[PDB]
Each structure stands twice: as structure tokens, then as C-alpha cells.
Amino acid sequence: MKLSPREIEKLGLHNAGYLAQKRLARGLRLNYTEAVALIATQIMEFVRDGDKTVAQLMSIGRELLGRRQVLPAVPKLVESVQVEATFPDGTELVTIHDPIACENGNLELALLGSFLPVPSLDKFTANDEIPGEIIVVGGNLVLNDGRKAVILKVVNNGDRPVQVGSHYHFIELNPYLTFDRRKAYGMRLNIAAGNASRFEPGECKEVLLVSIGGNKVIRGGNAIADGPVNASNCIAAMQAVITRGFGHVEEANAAEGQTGEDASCPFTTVISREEYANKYGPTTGDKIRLGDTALFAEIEKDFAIYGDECTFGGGKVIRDGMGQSCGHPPALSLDTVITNAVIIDYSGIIKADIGIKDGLIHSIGKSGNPDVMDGVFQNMTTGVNTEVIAGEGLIVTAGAIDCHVHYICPQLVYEAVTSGITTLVGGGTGPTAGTRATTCTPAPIQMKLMLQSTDDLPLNFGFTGKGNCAKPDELHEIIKAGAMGLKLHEDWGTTPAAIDSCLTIAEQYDIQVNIHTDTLNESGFVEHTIAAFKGRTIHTYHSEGAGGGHAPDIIKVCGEKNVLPSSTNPTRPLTSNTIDEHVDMLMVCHHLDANIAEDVAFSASRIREATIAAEDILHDMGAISIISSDSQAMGRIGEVISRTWQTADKMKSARGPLQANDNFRIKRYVAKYTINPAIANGFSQYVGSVEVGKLADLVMWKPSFFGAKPEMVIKGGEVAYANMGDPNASIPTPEPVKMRPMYGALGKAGGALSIAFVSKAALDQRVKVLYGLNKRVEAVSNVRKLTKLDMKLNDALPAITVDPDSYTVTADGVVLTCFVATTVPLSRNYFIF
Amino acid sequence: MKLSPREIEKLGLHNAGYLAQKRLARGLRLNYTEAVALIATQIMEFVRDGDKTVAQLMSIGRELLGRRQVLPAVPKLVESVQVEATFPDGTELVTIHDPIACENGNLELALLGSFLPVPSLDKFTANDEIPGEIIVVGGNLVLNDGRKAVILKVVNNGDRPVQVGSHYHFIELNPYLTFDRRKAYGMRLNIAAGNASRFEPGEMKEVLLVSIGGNKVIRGGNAIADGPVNASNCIAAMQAVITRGFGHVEEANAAEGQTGEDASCPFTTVISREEYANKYGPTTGDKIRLGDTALFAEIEKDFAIYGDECTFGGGKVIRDGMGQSCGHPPALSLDTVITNAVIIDYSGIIKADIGIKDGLIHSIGKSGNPDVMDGVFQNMTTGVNTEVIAGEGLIVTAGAIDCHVHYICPQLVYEAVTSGITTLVGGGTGPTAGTRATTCTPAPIQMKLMLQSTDDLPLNFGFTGKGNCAKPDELHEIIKAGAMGLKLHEDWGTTPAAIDSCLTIAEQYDIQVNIHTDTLNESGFVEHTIAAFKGRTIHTYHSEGAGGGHAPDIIKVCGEKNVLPSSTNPTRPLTSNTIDEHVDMLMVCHHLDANIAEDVAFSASRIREATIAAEDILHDMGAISIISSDSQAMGRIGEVISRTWQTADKMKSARGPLQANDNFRIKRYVAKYTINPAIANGFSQYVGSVEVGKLADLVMWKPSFFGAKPEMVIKGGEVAYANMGDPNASIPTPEPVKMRPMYGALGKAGGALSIAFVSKAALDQRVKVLYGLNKRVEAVSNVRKLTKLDMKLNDALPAITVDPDSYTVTADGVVLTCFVATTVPLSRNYFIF
Numbered sequence A: 001m002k003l004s005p006r007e008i009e010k011l012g013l014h015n016a017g018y019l020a021q022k023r024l025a026r027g028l029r030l031n032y033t034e035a036v037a038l039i040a041t042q043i044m045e046f047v048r049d050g051d052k053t054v055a056q057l058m059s060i061g062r063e064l065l066g067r068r069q070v071l072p073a074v075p076k077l078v079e080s081v082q083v084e085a086t087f088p089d090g091t092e093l094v095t096i097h098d099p100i101a102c103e104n105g106n107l108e109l110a111l112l113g114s115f116l117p118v119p120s121l122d123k124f125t126a127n128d129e130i131p132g133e134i135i136v137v138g139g140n141l142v143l144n145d146g147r148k149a150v151i152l153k154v155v156n157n158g159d160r161p162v163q164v165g166s167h168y169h170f171i172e173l174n175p176y177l178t179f180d181r182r183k184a185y186g187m188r189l190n191i192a193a194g195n196a197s198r199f200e201p202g203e204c205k206e207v208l209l210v211s212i213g214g215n216k217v218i219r220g221g222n223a224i225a226d227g228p229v230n231a232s233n234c235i236a237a238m239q240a241v242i243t244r245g246f247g248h249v250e251e252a253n254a255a256e257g258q259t260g261e262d263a264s265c266p267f268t269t270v271i272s273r274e275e276y277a278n279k280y281g282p283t284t285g286d287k288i289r290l291g292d293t294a295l296f297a298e299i300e301k302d303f304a305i306y307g308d309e310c311t312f313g314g315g316k317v318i319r320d321g322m323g324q325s326c327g328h329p330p331a332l333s334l335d336t337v338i339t340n341a342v343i344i345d346y347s348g349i350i351k352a353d354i355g356i357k358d359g360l361i362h363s364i365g366k367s368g369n370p371d372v373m374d375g376v377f378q379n380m381t382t383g384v385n386t387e388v389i390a391g392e393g394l395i396v397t398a399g400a401i402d403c404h405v406h407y408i409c410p411q412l413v414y415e416a417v418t419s420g421i422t423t424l425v426g427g428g429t430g431p432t433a434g435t436r437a438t439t440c441t442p443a444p445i446q447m448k449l450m451l452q453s454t455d456d457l458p459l460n461f462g463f464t465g466k467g468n469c470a471k472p473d474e475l476h477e478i479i480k481a482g483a484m485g486l487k488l489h490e491d492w493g494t495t496p497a498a499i500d501s502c503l504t505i506a507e508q509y510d511i512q513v514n515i516h517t518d519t520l521n522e523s524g525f526v527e528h529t530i531a532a533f534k535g536r537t538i539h540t541y542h543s544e545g546a547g548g549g550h551a552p553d554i555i556k557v558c559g560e561k562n563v564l565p566s567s568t569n570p571t572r573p574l575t576s577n578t579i580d581e582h583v584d585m586l587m588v589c590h591h592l593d594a595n596i597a598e599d600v601a602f603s604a605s606r607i608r609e610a611t612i613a614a615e616d617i618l619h620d621m622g623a624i625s626i627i628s629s630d631s632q633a634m635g636r637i638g639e640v641i642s643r644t645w646q647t648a649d650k651m652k653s654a655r656g657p658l659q660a661n662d663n664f665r666i667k668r669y670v671a672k673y674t675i676n677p678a679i680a681n682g683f684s685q686y687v688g689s690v691e692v693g694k695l696a697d698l699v700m701w702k703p704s705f706f707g708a709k710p711e712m713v714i715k716g717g718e719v720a721y722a723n724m725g726d727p728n729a730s731i732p733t734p735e736p737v738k739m740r741p742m743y744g745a746l747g748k749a750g751g752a753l754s755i756a757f758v759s760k761a762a763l764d765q766r767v768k769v770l771y772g773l774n775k776r777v778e779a780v781s782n783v784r785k786l787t788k789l790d791m792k793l794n795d796a797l798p799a800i801t802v803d804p805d806s807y808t809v810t811a812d813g814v815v816l817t818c819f820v821a822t823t824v825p826l827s828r829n830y831f832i833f
Numbered sequence B: 001m002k003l004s005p006r007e008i009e010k011l012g013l014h015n016a017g018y019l020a021q022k023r024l025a026r027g028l029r030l031n032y033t034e035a036v037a038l039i040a041t042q043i044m045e046f047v048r049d050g051d052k053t054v055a056q057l058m059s060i061g062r063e064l065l066g067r068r069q070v071l072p073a074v075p076k077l078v079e080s081v082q083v084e085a086t087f088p089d090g091t092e093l094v095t096i097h098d099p100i101a102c103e104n105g106n107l108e109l110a111l112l113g114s115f116l117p118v119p120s121l122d123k124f125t126a127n128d129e130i131p132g133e134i135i136v137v138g139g140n141l142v143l144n145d146g147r148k149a150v151i152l153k154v155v156n157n158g159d160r161p162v163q164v165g166s167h168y169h170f171i172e173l174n175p176y177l178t179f180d181r182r183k184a185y186g187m188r189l190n191i192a193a194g195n196a197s198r199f200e201p202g203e204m205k206e207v208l209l210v211s212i213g214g215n216k217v218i219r220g221g222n223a224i225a226d227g228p229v230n231a232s233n234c235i236a237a238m239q240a241v242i243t244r245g246f247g248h249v250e251e252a253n254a255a256e257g258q259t260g261e262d263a264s265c266p267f268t269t270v271i272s273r274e275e276y277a278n279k280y281g282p283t284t285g286d287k288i289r290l291g292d293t294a295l296f297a298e299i300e301k302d303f304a305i306y307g308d309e310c311t312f313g314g315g316k317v318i319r320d321g322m323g324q325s326c327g328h329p330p331a332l333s334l335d336t337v338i339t340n341a342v343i344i345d346y347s348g349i350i351k352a353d354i355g356i357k358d359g360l361i362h363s364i365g366k367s368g369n370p371d372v373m374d375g376v377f378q379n380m381t382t383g384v385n386t387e388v389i390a391g392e393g394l395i396v397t398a399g400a401i402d403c404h405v406h407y408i409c410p411q412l413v414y415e416a417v418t419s420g421i422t423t424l425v426g427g428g429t430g431p432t433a434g435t436r437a438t439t440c441t442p443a444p445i446q447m448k449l450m451l452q453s454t455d456d457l458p459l460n461f462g463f464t465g466k467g468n469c470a471k472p473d474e475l476h477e478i479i480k481a482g483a484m485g486l487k488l489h490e491d492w493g494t495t496p497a498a499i500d501s502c503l504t505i506a507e508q509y510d511i512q513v514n515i516h517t518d519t520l521n522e523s524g525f526v527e528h529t530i531a532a533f534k535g536r537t538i539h540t541y542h543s544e545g546a547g548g549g550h551a552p553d554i555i556k557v558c559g560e561k562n563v564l565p566s567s568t569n570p571t572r573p574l575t576s577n578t579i580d581e582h583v584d585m586l587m588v589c590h591h592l593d594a595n596i597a598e599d600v601a602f603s604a605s606r607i608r609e610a611t612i613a614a615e616d617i618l619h620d621m622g623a624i625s626i627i628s629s630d631s632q633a634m635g636r637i638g639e640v641i642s643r644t645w646q647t648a649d650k651m652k653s654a655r656g657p658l659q660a661n662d663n664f665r666i667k668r669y670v671a672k673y674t675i676n677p678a679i680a681n682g683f684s685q686y687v688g689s690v691e692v693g694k695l696a697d698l699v700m701w702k703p704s705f706f707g708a709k710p711e712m713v714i715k716g717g718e719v720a721y722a723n724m725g726d727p728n729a730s731i732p733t734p735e736p737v738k739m740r741p742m743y744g745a746l747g748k749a750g751g752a753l754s755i756a757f758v759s760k761a762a763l764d765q766r767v768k769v770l771y772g773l774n775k776r777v778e779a780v781s782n783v784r785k786l787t788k789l790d791m792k793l794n795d796a797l798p799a800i801t802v803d804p805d806s807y808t809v810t811a812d813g814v815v816l817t818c819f820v821a822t823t824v825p826l827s828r829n830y831f832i833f
């Protein structure tokens, strides 16, 4: 067949269309991903037929699926569908804009060529009544306040069209525009940042101009006015205007003034507030729905000065001598700027530009060019050598950190980064019995190998040894080898003696101890394991206990001051299939028999509605500080983030507000998979939050998709993984769009962008050198003096009791009961399976 | 002063002349080295004076030192003295040939400028009555037997001199030589390999010509006769002789025959036998005095076919198409050939060419070009790409192997290679108390460091850990780190428990255990340590015991079948200062007081004339198998070799012959610092003898200096260290000549040429990769099944008793007594201090 790659991919795309076609013919309402596959698939077939032109399919594509055939969110999610195919005259791109352009679509034609029977309308469900919607405050904003202003007559005396961007130095215009060049001096158009005025030939326009800000130095254009704005350089600019024949007619009468903050001043330009949000993303006071949850994030603070937003593109702001600085010291240009980002972080929900330098977050604030703009500090310069990642309208958060990882297969890793995870911590050596049961890399040799194995992958890694030992001998060895933490697991024996010996070792080496307790209460009940901690910091895995630990009351640990507790994700939150699923999963993982009295006793003692319900609440209470996966050993790597938001969404709907928005809950929860995993494991100076001085491990989200599927994963300042369409296409957006590794994941790049975390002892020996690692290696630290109070926004310490028969949990006197949700967000709207 | 390096060196050369001047003024008869410094020094001063010419100094230099002023060896050792100095007309080279050209010299003039009083003749001792002398068998040798021959008239009709080498293809000569070219076809001159016949213009000579050998293929010269010699190529050669105007007159009458082995055949050429030895070094039956000892090596076998010796030089044998082959497959050219070497090695004293390829000894035999010489095998081809090291007249031995090394300072190392040592085995970490007492590199960290440290040094290295332990735990670790052997030392405790635990480990890891027993008999007497061996292989260091062990009878170990025993070198052999030196040395190392009864008791129990006398004998018996240094911890790195021969010289003179030459003794001893240290430590497949397949770690000796100072040290095929004179000079021989590192000692080369030995367990983990070592790393093996019978030529097992009071040693019933020698060879004749 001589299949080129693009042919192979389209076969896949087609397969997805056909599956969507089969669901449609069943009278299922299609989700976003289904609508897309189906339409791209048909477009490709119509091109194969050879009967239809591009202009035709542009129309035909709007009339396949109608409001009736799709889910309530789809008409807002599907802005359009793009695909390329081979027409009779070669490859052509077809864009279908607003494909849900009607009520009924055309079923016959949506299925045409599939040979699937065409369903009747009444086979489809009835329409129900907008993910990531921006709720704009009512009103207008005056651009560019407190600046000298002038209105000038401008003529296009050329024979061709001339168009001028918002930030072009007006004196430097095409010599064929005629106006008062002297009055234009130091001025630029008073219009929304990044648009333009178009002058057809012969046209006369009356233009509102406003003064440039900051240092008021003009660079570029025609070099008419090179230099700082002053009386002396004005005289020189005018000399050059005359000599070089730049169109000039004095307007002695021109209205002059300033942009004053009051009503009906003719120099001022206003921008409708809904429209501000659409161009540049939301600003202070606006709220943003997280994905299709019920959560709203309100912009708390904005660094933007209205009218100088950093937007990149033709005629736009980020151009030489305008928004892009020219003449500052080269070493301080930002490597990359992320423009107009909504940052959601435990430390604040804000609107800001983010500058990246040397793989690090260099600054957060208002960025651009100090020669032309007020308010640009010397650490936020967009310069010649600065790349641009456009955040307008998107959310940025820290890369997620999953601190309960089983390295069972390398593909867990791709699934992780693709969901928004950039750091993994746990143990394993591949698909062995030991690794499948416990987060342990047991032999020094295997430490060596896992570090070397994962050395090119664009994530930060930590590996943990087997902590189950009643003598320190072999623990010293595994830490010296490079383990950055130890796992105490019952399958290797978690006994008071092992617990003690392992914590004494943690005290010496400043590493975290993660524990899965003695479910069987073989050598003690939970109180005996707590006693054995002896007031020493310890991280308790899946603290609720479905995934392991003292039956039935391991959850008591969420009330010990020295315990840092996490949950794993599959019990999150309590939903209608939770219990059934987990019982059987337990039966499967423990090789138990549905028909034996005691097998079923063990399992009913392990998987308990009363405690999972309590887990939803303690999680909302900030009594459980972290959420993690338990990847392929009871939990799900790609669902750390979504299960966090699904827990938040359920609690918002069940419980009281926590402090006219959901900010306090949003920040509490984002902390559970970003900052708190980093604190617990001892590397929070390097990652876990959007703050200056930390790795620029950064995930871009569409608000409509937030918490389900991100756009782009930045690793150490460079794009590591991202949504990507047809590699052969004329743009990146045509089908099939899927998460693929990017330049940050090829060759040596993964290593240059990331950190392998080891113990200080291992680093003292330079295991980075010994092991031949190209990834940066750093030591973990500051882990032996943590208490629950060091967990950001999750420092609650209830008195917990658990009834040994009913399993009912009481916290601070209050019986904890929670309902069984029948659905969750961030699921049916997003996934093809 | 702006001193260049040469100026700095000559200052040292001067200082040596002046010291030699002071000694002469005292009426000391000078040795070789003194004579040289003195004469070069005066020559440089006479040059400074500016009064005398080169030709003058050439005569004056002969009349400074006379037979009276020098030791008996000097007139044979000092063939000449060369130096270069700045005359009024720039730098010029002065060679003084045969500087002892008279009886009285000229004292005043030998001191002139030194302002030292000129001694009178009677202050000098009276003359006494030849180191490395060759004793030639009486007679002649017929060259080139069994070959077609012809005598031809040859005339030089050219106007300039023409000279032809022994192996040039005669038909290929200058076209101005006139002779019968057709008879000359396939012939060459029948003269000694490497010389020539000179034709002045117009001269007529009657030349003996003999047929070429091997395949008889002609290549090179003028391309007259390109091809295998046969009637068809003859016809073509004659065509080209006619066409190209090569001088040709038919000699219809020429005498034709062959080289018969009878007397007075006019076609044959004989070489006087003494002359043969002088040109090509000795052959079968000749004998060579080792240095200035009484030892004589007789050549047991010669591979040469008389007349085809490989000698390289202008006009000589090793030239394109003659002895240097042209047309064989390029991959099989030797990298280097050592021509006409006497090899002295445990396995035989012989005469052979030695072929080196890929740093290994590739072949031993008759080397050359199979197209023109008989007897050249395919693995002995001197090719275009073959380097020549000329061994004619010289002795080649394996690199010495010192297996009792304390790494106290890096300089031990240079002192070792410069004396002829290429492998070191021992322990240490530098000048610490532990390393100054024991051959122990105790920490894994220090193993890594010492291997990294010594990585560029052109010697093979083995490091040994601390074997003193009653538990195996840390012993496992040091071997895994890379130790290739363990040392049990009393200073760390050599108790029966430690001995057992250590040897049990050696059985697991296949490494050698070296021991210095419990001198104090604190824990047991020697019996008890022997019992603790439990029949297991163990290397006993300084088995005599002055250097350490059970007082007074450690020597008993030389009679245990599982013991491999070595001596250190300072007690070798028993001479008049031995006992006095050692008592004090013991006092100093043990911080003892001459005035405390028990300090003097311990000392007298440790240092024992009776046992040291017995050591001379058991050494000669082949009852002690190895001689080693104990470098800087009672022993002397640069004297492993000299002390071995000094011992052999003293026993020759004291005892009966061992099997009309000294071959058996010579071989027995050479094995003590070559093959037996490599067998005992487990790397004898790589080094320790001049045998095919092993590294080309080879030392070139002048017989006159053999066992004192070597000429050249070849490390893995490349010269690593050698005598070198003035780097500014026109030749390499002018003063000051001293041992200097060569190209094998610079940059990356030392590593490329050598091996670091580790345990198999360490190599299993790739410590070579972990430690970033550029030196090749290999594992030691085949060491736990050795018995004294595996020691080459040193396998004797006497029943030994030692009287606890008289210290008298008895071996097989015989009381061992030996005299205190007053002098030793390989000392006063050679050293400047």
C-alpha cells in the first residue's frame, strides 16, 4: 500500500468517525469528540467521491449533525471541524464553522456511505437545556487613561491599501499617508491592543491618537523619529519627514487633550467588557466555570494596564520597537512569555503575563517594552529573542505531581504527562509481582536502572525503596543508591518494628516515609501503628483505606498532627458504581472467592461506604491534604486532576460555601496535586506551584476543557507534549487532533528540561555522575519536621472516631454521611470511551 | 633569566659534573655515570670559554679521565660522551669517542674551572683487573645456504658514486651500473645483512650475487622486474632494460653455482662469528653476562636464517620490496617489530624477532618479507605500516610485576616503570597511617578514587581491600567496589577468625588473599595460623618475616602446599649491612626505644640473621616463589629487579650449579618478578611473560646494564618511558640522559595501553562504566586452586623447622647457613648516589 504516515492516521480518524456513526444510528446523542470524528470522516469520504468542492463541503458540513443529535454542551464546545483530504485536484483543507447550525441535521447524510440504517428522529432523546463560560461584569473600560491625546485627519494618497496596528509609532507610517506628522510624534492609535485601522486608497479618516508610555523612546519603523520623545528629537524627525518625502500637512486646529477618566471625552476609547474578556481573557471581577463542573473561579487581581495587553500577531502589539523591546541588555530578554494567562494556583487566582528564563519562572506581572509602556519592570521584558505562548482566554496551572506511582509500564508515563502531570514519585521495576503490589524499587541496581531508563523522559522523577525492615542495614544501601523516599507496605510486612526502624532511618537521611498499613491488624490495630510512628512525620497513602490499611479505621490518621495524609483517586468521589467496582477489584487483586465466608468478610471489612463517604468530606474539610493515582495498582494515572475536580464539584453541590465564587475551594483543591505533593516529598522549592524561581512546569488549559484534557504541557520552559493535528496539514488544528510528544520529548531534550530527585547521601556520592544521567539530579530535603499544618490550605485536624461495626465515621463530634452521586462532570462530555 | 628548559637541564647536568669533580678531587675512582657528568660538564665550560673548536674538544675530551681515575668497568661502559653547548658560533654537538683513551688522564684539566685542588695520582687507589660481555663460540657462518648463485663484473659508468644495499634487487640498480642484467635477475648481493657495496665512478667490481628467497617476488626499485621470478617475467625485464637504457653487457662466461655448505666455494660468504654477535647480537651457543653479575645466559635457540636478519637503516634490510613486504594483505602488517632480540623469560632464553599487533605480542620468530625471504610465516610480516624497534645487541624481558605495593605517593610509580616495572598490585590511599603500614585501600569510595587517580598512568594496577574481619559483611562490599584481592595485616588484626572469614570470602569471589601474620603470636603461633588457612590458597607476604609475621618461625610457610610465598626485597640478599639496617628500621617503624628491655627483645625476635640466611637459600631452592618491593613500608620500589639478580649472583657464587651456563638459575629467578606474581594474583593470561597473546609490556636492556637500568619500557605496544637526552639536541643521546616519560605516558595514552584489574563481581556491575575509567578493566581469576606447584620453576616444598632459641632453620634435614656477602653487583657501577 506504500502508506505514508498521514494515511495511517486518517484510517484511525475514519475508524473513530465510523464508531461515532454506529453510536448515532443507535440514537445516542454525540459528545464533542464524537461530533468531530464523524464530521471529519464524512468530509473525507465526500472528497473521495470527487463530486463536491471545498466551498460545498464548507456548507454540507454544517448540515450533518443538528442540535437534536448532540449533547447540551456540544454546540458551545464545537466551534468547528477541520480536515484535509485528497480532492481530484490534490490536497485541500476544509473548515466547517459552527457545525451545529441547525435543529435536525441530516441523518441520512451523516451516515451516508457507512451502510448503517438511518435512525428516525424519535429514536433520539429529547433536548435538555456551557463549559468554561466567562461571566463578564456589566460595563465598559476606558483604554489608556491619563495620557496626552490628539485627533488627526489622515489621508491615504497611495494607490494601494495601508493598514496600521494599535501600537505602531504613528510618525513612522508609510510615506503615502498624509497628516500632521509633528502632532503624530510620540503617538500611536488609541484602539484596542492588537487591532488596526485600514485605509483603502484615497480614504480619509479621523484618528484618535494617544501618547506612548514608559520611557517614551521610539525605535524602528522607518527610523524617522529614532530616539527618546523630546523637543530636540522632534526637530530631527521633522527634518527627516521633509527630506525623505513623508506625507505631511500641518493641522494647526487639531483637537488636543488627554484621556481623562470621565464620560464623553472625545479622545478616549472604550471597550465593551464582554468583548475585553473575549479578546484578552477575563479580568478582575470576571468568573470562569471550571470545565463542565459547577465551580467558578473569580479573577482576584490583574496586572494588565488596560490598552497595553501583550498580544502577538500581524499588526499586533508584540512587534519590533512597539511591545517588543529594542535596546535593553540582551541577557535580560525573556526566553518565553506566556501572555494574558489566568493563573489558578494555591497562592491566588489572578491575571498576569508569565515570563520564563533558563527553564525557570522568571516573573509574573505585566510584561512588554519599557520604552513604550508604563509599568514594565526590568524582569519582564519581551525582546527580540523572546518566544511567545499566547495565554489569552486560557488557564495556566502548575504541572501536577503524582506521588503514589507504580512504575508498572512506561506507558503510564505518557498517559500522565498527557493529562497534565509533570512529576512522578513512587517505586517499581516494571510489571513484576512486587511492583504491581507496592511502590518499591528494591535493589540498588534497579535504582540505577530506573533512573537511567527514564533519563530521556520529560518528567521529574523520584524512586522509592522498600522500607519494610526491622534492621537499618539494607535501608542505608537503598538510599545511598538514590532512593529519595521509602515505602512501607503490608505485602512486605508493615509491623511496628519495621515502622520504627524505617522512621529512624528517615530521621537520618531527610527522606519521606510513605506507608500502606497492616490491614489485617496482624500485629496491632491502628493505634499501635500510630504509637510506632512516635510523633515522627510520615506520609500515609490512601488514608481512607479502600486501597490498604487497618480495617476498618485507618482513616483515623487524618487527625494526627505528624501524619501527612493522601487519598488515591478511584474512590473519588463516592458515586453509584464506586462500591461495586471496588469490591470486585479487591476480590481480583487479592485472589479471593465470592463463595467463601472469610474471603467475603475481608473484603467487606476493606471496602466501606461509610469511610468513602467520610473521605469526600475530609477531603473538602482539608483534612486530607493530597490526591494521587495509585497507577495500575488500584488507581488511575490520567485521572489525578479530574478526580480532584470531580470531588470539588460534588462537595460544592452537597455542602456549605467555604469562604459569590468558589475561589477558596478551588485553591484548597488545586493544592492537593501540586504544592502539597512537593512539600511532602521535599522538593517544593523546585516545583509544585506557579511562583518565581521554580521550574516552568506549566499546563495550559481551555476553560471549556479544564480538569479533563489540557492543550499543552510546558516542561522546564519548553513545550513537551500537546494536542496536535495532521502533521501534513496547512495548520496544526485539522484532524486527527491528539496528545503527542513535542520537541521537549525528543533526543536529549527530555533530560535538559527535568529533574531526577535522589536522597542527599546519593548526591553526596554523585550518583548523577556514576549513573551517566543527562537529566539534572537534585536532593530532596526539609521533610522530617513537617506536620499537617505545613499542608497548604489542607491543615485540618479533626478528632476522628470510627465505629467498629457500623464503620460510621465521626469527626469533631459530627457524624459524617454523604450521598451517592449518580453522575460526575469531566467525563461523558470529553471521552470517546 | 628567561631560562629555557634546556638551560635548566644543563644546570642539573653541570651540578652532576661538579659533584663528580668533588669526588675525583678526593681521589675516588669514578663510575660510569660520574665519568659522563664530569666530561659533558667540562665540554660545556670549554665552550663557554670560547677558545676551543668542536674538533679540539673531540681530542681534549679523550684526555681528561684516564684509566687510573675510573673503576674497572668504566673503560668498557663509556663508549663515548656527547653534549651540545653554545659556542661563539651557536649550538654545536661534541662527541667524545672512547674517553678513557689513556692511563693517567689530565687531572688539572678535568677540574679546571671548578676551583677544586687538583689531587696527585698516588691519592687514587691502584687499578684492579666487563659487564654484559658476549662470549662468542669460535668460528665462521656461511650466509644464505642452499641458494642459486653467480659472480658478475659490475662497472660504474656514471659520474657520481653509486652504493648498493645487501637486499636491493640487483636488476633494479641505477641505470649507470653496467653488468649482465639477465644474470642479475632475481639476485641480490651476497654480503652480510645490512651492508653495502660502494662503487666510486669508473670503478669495476667482481660481485658475489645470491638468489632471493621465499616466494621470489620482485617489487620496487625502478619497476624493471615487477613480478614473481620466472622465465616469462625475465623476458619482460629484459625488454624494459633495453627500452629504458639500463646498462647491460652480456657476460656469457660468468661463473654460476650455488651456496653449498662446504669450505672454499667461491660463491659463498662467511661472517666471522664474533662479528656476527656484534652486528646482530648473540646467536645459538653464545653467552651473555647479566650486567656486572657473574651470571651467563646462553642462547638456547635462534630463529634467524643466517643472512636475512631484520636490520633497519640506510641501505639496510628493512626497505620497500626487500625485507619490508609490499602486497600482503594490509591488515596483517605488524604494528611494531622488535628485531634481533635476546629474550630472557621463564620459558626460555632465545633469539627471535618479536611482532606486536593491537598492543599484544602477535608472534615470536623469524620476521620479514615472504616475497624475498625463506621462513617467514604469515603472522611475522614487516609491512609498510610497521614500526621498528631495533633489539640487535639488546635483551628483552617481560615488564616486571610488583605485587607488594603500598600506594604511599605517586612518585613510587614513576620510580617503578623507570626501573622496568609495568604492573603494580597492592593497596593504599596515599600517605596515611593505614597505607604506610598496610597494603589496604579500605573504603569503596577510595577504590573508586584510586582507580580514577591512576587512570592515565601507563601501568596495569590492582588494588586490595582490608581483609581483616571476623564477619564477611564489609568484605563483600570492598570486592564489589572493585578490590581485586584482600590484604590481612596484623596492624588491623590477623587472627584465626579473621583469616578464616577472609579466605571463605576469597573462595566466593576468586581473588587472592595476601597475608602478613600475627608477629606477636597474640592469638596463636604459626601452626595456628596455618590451621586457620584450612588448606586454602593464600599468598604469604615477606615469608621470611623481617617484614612481619610469627616470631621467629613464619618461614615455615614455604613448606605448605597451599601457600604461595613471596619475599620483599630489602633483606635480599644477606649482606654485611643488612641486620644493622633492619633492626633500626624496625625500631623506627615500631617507635621503639633502644634502652627498654622488651622493645629490644621484640626487635631481636623479628630481625634474624638465621632466617634471612635461610631466605637466600630457599630463594635459590625455588622454595620462595616471588620477589616484591614493599615500596616505602620496609621495601624499595625500584629494586625488585636488581635485588632478584643480586640474590641470584650471590647464590651462584655460594652454592652448586643448578642444571656450562646459568640458564636454569636465570629462568628460575626471572619468574619471581614476572610470571609468578601474575599467576598468584590471577591475571597471567594478560601479562607476566614474553608469550604470544599477552600484552606487549616489554623492557629493552643493554646487557652491560641488565638488572640495573633498562633503556626503554614498552607498554602495550608503545614506548611509555625511556632514557632520553637533551630535547634540543641533534640526536637523542647527548647529555643529560635520564629516564623520562614518553608518548605512552601523555594525555589519554596511558589508559589506552594498560589494564586496571578488578574482581569479577565488580566488573559484573561495570565499575569501569560507573567510575568513568578510560583504562581497560579486566577481572582477575583462577586463584582459588593454585598450590606451590603452580609457581613456575619455584615449586619446592621443604620440610622446615626453626629452632625457637637459636632461630636456626632446617630444610629437609639440612641446616641452612649462608655467608654475609660484603658487596653486591648492580650498585656501585651504576648509581650516582
Ligand code: NI
Residues within 6 Å of the ligand: A516, A541, A542, A547, A548
Ligand atoms: Ni497501598
Ligand code: NI
Residues within 6 Å of the ligand: A404, A406, A437, A438, A439, A630, A633
Ligand atoms: Ni499503591
Ligand code: NI
Residues within 6 Å of the ligand: B516, B541, B542, B547, B548
Ligand atoms: Ni607486611
Ligand code: NI
Residues within 6 Å of the ligand: B404, B406, B437, B438, B439, B630, B633
Ligand atoms: Ni607491606
